[PDB]
């Protein structure tokens, strides 16, 4: 769906799941902008 589309705080405290990581801002994907420092939730390198 493209509705609720954000994650963690921003996203109505509902994550991305299994792996996809979170940023900062409240949005799904992968990379240093997601999985890197800023993560809220996911597979995230810290």
Partial sequence: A????RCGEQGSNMECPNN???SQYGYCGMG???????????????
């Fill in 32 to 46: 240093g902008d997601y999985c890197g420092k800023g993560c809220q939730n996911g597979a995230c390198w810290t």
């Fill in 20 to 22: 996809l990581c979170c």
């Fill in 2 to 5: 493209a509705a609720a589309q």
